[PDB]
Amino acid sequence: KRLPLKPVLRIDFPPGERLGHGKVELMQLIAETGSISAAGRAMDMSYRRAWLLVDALNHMFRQPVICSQRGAALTVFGAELLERYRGMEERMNEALREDIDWLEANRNPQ
Template identity: 40%
Template sequence: MKKDINLLMRHWVFVDGQKFFGPGRMELLEGIEETGSIVKAAKAMGMSYKKAWAMVDALNTLGSQPYVITQKGGQQGGGAQLTDQAKQVIIAYKQLTGKLTEVLEAEKELIKLI
């Protein structure tokens, strides 16, 4: 009987031993870019605002430059936007993901052995 066997991988970037960037933070940043809001991005992910804010704070603190710039509420309402640094990291992370996926695809011989 033929079985459906897959190789899966997740990867993160650590800074000073702390998880800095990975799939969840990338998804959060993309949500902020799309909605202009940490609250809306967190809600779309089913994540609490507190957790989302902690992730943004870690990115802004551990990164070489800020990743998210926030504006406080008022008549126009608050909001958030990504910096160029954040956009560049998202692109680089996606490129790394693509390269790692290619390596996994090339190693399909393992699957044949299972």
């Protein structure tokens, strides 16, 4: 047995930016641990590199995505962004289902 074929989504924010697995995982991990340093640790990166992803997220949109507290959290908007990316993933999977079947039939068994 191996795992199924799986589409993965990223969205380009031209010119400089992206929203994909790395920023979504950070967001999910902030929702779960309440900590930027913990999320960075989980993802095997320095606090600097993690914090720069946070900083990117807080300048990509009209509202902040992550905020401090008494020490981090998703804002109302951040939670909305995360749910909408999850929905996009679901919608993409639905749309590509037949294409995946064709890839799967054509995939080398080994």
